[PDB]
Amino acid sequence: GKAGDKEWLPVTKLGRLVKDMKIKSLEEIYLFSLPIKESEIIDFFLGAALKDKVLKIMPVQKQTQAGQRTRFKAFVAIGDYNGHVGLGMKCSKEVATAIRGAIILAKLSIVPVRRGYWGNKIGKPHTVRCKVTGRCGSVLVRLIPAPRGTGIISAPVPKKLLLMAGIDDCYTSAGGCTATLGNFAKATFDAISKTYSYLTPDLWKETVFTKSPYQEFTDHLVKTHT
RNA sequence: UACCUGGUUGAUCCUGCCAGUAGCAUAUGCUUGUCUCAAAGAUUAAGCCAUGCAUGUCUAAGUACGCACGGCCGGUACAGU
């Protein structure tokens, strides 16, 4: 060879524990609900199963005395089929740059989904935990559980997101405008997010509590480290 | 298969209709090699009709002098068909 690599040097505390390798799953991060700020952290644990699916590339434009001025705004989905999905929108003066700007922003906003069973257990979840909703500006979706082998029955736009989530079988119902897909996709994304925030009788058992990764590994975060 | 997509603006988010989509049954266009199943003058004029046909029927057992046939030998109630 004659060419090295050097990629990523964290300037963030959370980034430093991952690069020095003390955190070894996303599940640690999420349990303390820490901010994520660097898009390499997510792409280190994953990035070996993340795909992108560019939904729309939509023009928008404002008005000035010299005429039109046009910016391109594109939406880009991201997700592995193991239950982590995310979504981002971004705009720029040119097309390709806006797409690549959206793939970064989408990595940042990745969240987990909680899957469950129709009513009888047989191992390996296949549907949504419970009947949930999510609204974004008078578009809404109502993800309703479904038995095995019925597939995802939805419009083409949410059929992307739910498929990327790894949710196998679902029924949906929409209300209001859905031709303004920027709302429609965010409303789907809203619905899948709420799954872990829905309290179920399962979760009534008490959580132990444990000290933060920041707390326990603080001796490695002070030597010269950020 | 518990589903949507295009269109009011310089641009955005709504309200709302229009158009797109699929099945079903009537008509119609164009095209048609083999097999099984088969709906068919209802929609309008319960308007009008040539011609042909669509309800007849006898057992040992209601009535046989058909001069019909037959008999064989006829008639005494009197054969058989």
Side-chain angles (χ1 to χ4, degrees):
Chain A
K2 59 183 90 292
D5 192 56
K6 75 298 172 61
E7 204 67 61
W8 189 38
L9 183 64
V11 293
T12 303
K13 189 172 292 299
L14 183 57
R16 189 74 276 179
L17 288 179
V18 172
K19 187 58 180 296
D20 295 306
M21 201 65 167
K22 301 294 182 298
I23 296 176
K24 292 191 171 60
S25 54
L26 289 175
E27 310 310 298
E28 293 176 55
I29 312 177
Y30 293 140
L31 181 55
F32 290 94
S33 306
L34 303 175
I36 181 170
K37 292 180 185 176
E38 303 187 306
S39 300
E40 300 302 289
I41 302 175
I42 185 59
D43 200 67
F44 171 68
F45 297 117
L46 280 292
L50 296 173
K51 291 83 204 66
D52 292 297
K53 292 182 178 176
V54 183
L55 300 175
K56 191 173 178 180
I57 301 176
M58 180 175 174
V60 289
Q61 50 187 172
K62 62 188 298 302
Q63 184 67 277
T64 188
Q65 57 182 354
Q68 314 303 112
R69 176 179 175 193
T70 193
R71 310 177 69 191
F72 298 113
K73 183 172 72 171
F75 298 82
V76 181
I78 186 171
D80 49 69
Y81 305 110
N82 307 305
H84 292 286
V85 265
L87 179 58
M89 46 182 276
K90 177 58 179 296
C91 54
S92 300
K93 300 302 303 300
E94 305 297 299
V95 178
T97 188
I99 301 172
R100 191 182 70 255
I103 297 167
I104 298 297
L105 197 69
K107 283 172 180 178
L108 196 65
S109 301
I110 290 177
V111 286
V113 303
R114 185 184 183 197
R115 294 194 295 269
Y117 296 89
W118 191 55
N120 55 87
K121 317 299 188 300
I122 199 62
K124 306 301 187 299
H126 64 98
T127 187
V128 294
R129 188 64 187 85
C130 47
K131 182 173 69 181
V132 288
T133 191
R135 60 175 296 277
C136 180
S138 74
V139 191
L140 60 89
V141 182
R142 184 176 53 156
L143 308 176
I144 300 168
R148 298 182 176 276
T150 57
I152 307 173
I153 305 186
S154 306
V157 182
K159 192 151 60 181
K160 292 289 184 63
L161 289 168
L162 296 169
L163 181 60
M164 285 281 261
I167 301 166
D168 297 75
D169 304 295
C170 200
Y171 301 132
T172 56
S173 296
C177 189
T178 39
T180 45
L181 72 81
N183 293 297
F184 192 18
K186 291 176 64 176
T188 302
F189 192 60
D190 189 51
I192 64 177
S193 190
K194 292 180 180 176
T195 55
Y196 268 111
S197 300
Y198 198 96
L199 184 64
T200 54
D202 294 54
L203 298 175
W204 287 356
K205 60 177 183 177
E206 181 53 56
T207 303
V208 189
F209 302 111
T210 187
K211 295 179 171 63
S212 298
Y214 283 7
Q215 186 170 3
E216 296 177 59
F217 296 115
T218 194
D219 64 296
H220 193 70
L221 285 171
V222 180
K223 287 196 293 187
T224 188
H225 296 68
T226 194

